[PDB]
Design a binder for this molecule. Structure first.
Ligand SMILES: Nc1ncnc2c1ncn2[C@@H]1O[C@H](CSCC[C@H](N)C(=O)O)[C@@H](O)[C@H]1O
Ligand SMILES: Cn1ncnc2c(=O)n(C)c(=O)nc1-2
Length: 241
């Protein structure tokens, strides 16, 4: 697992990157009220979203990550904060269902599907993890990002290259950390996302713009967010059966 070599540097990135506050705000906007819900947090990393979802009143939270090192970090945080989250090491593309939840949160899962066939398998696994009236809240790479239109290093993610891969693109990148931490991600097209969504059994879905807000603009020099708005690397997504 690539994040076995990143470990705590990812949390360092979340504390220094300008984009992270926008991601977090947008995701909690899409999630809404979590009181009493069962929640599955996929690609959970050290558990940030599932843990804050628990703190906001969720009934039960389970986290899944392909990285044994990241899950060991997640488990240690739960011990440190005395919280009841449970974690599993799995590749979400090939995992067996863990129950049916009110809410699946997948912040930075689908951009790690390394083929369009695995993108489709992931959406089917998510649908099988949902009750009929549940919902998926996802955060992923915007299909329209183009490396030539502007890099994202000033917001925290230095994208290094761009290469055709299957019907999409693959990108090497690094989180802007001390020292930088390398990873690779995949940019699948909007059509392929929407096809994977429909074929998994989600009859409703909507893309969600990142919630850049007035105070974000006020606390940087004018134009700081121009690349973020003109060549955004990220987008939200909500799906319902
Ligand atoms: N196929 C897969 N199945 C499960 N987890 C995966 C995966 N591919 C990548 N990941 C995990 O996805 C995580 C991306 S980092 C994002 C962590 C967390 N969602 C947060 O936003 O705070 C890493 O921990 C990585 O190991
Ligand atoms: C995990 N994670 N966290 C924050 N931001 C990103 C990101 O921009 N991209 C492109 C990405 O693949 N993964 C991210």
């Amino acid at each position: 697992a690539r994040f076995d070599s990143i470990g705590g540097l990812f949390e360092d990135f979340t504390q220094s990157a300008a984009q992270r506050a926008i991601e977090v705000r947008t995701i909690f906007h899409m999630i809404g009220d979590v009181s009493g819900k069962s929640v599955l947090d996929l690609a959970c990393g050290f558990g940030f979203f599932g843990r804050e979802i628990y703190r906001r009143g969720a009934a039960k939270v389970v986290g899944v990550d392909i990285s044994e090192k990241m899950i060991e970090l997640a488990r240690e945080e739960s011990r440190k904060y005395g919280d009841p989250l449970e974690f599993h090491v799995r590749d979400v593309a090939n995992m067996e269902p863990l129950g049916q939840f009110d809410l699946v949160n997948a912040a930075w899962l689908f951009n790690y599907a390394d083929s369009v066939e695995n993108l489709r398998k992931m959406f089917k696994v998510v649908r099988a993890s949902l009750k009929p009236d549940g919902k998926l809240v996802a955060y992923t790479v915007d299909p329209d990002f183009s490396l030539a239109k502007g890099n994202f290093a000033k917001y925290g993610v230095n994208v290094l290259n761009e290469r055709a891969w299957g019907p999409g693109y693959r990108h090497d990148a690094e989180f802007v950390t001390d020292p930088p931490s390398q990873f690779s991600f995949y940019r699948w097209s909007r059509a392929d996302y929407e096809s994977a969504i429909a074929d998994a059994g989600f009859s409703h879905f909507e893309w969600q713009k990142p919630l850049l807000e007035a105070d974000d603009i006020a606390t940087h020099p004018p134009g700081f967010w121009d690349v973020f708005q003109n060549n955004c690397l990220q987008t939200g997504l909500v799906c319902k059966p």
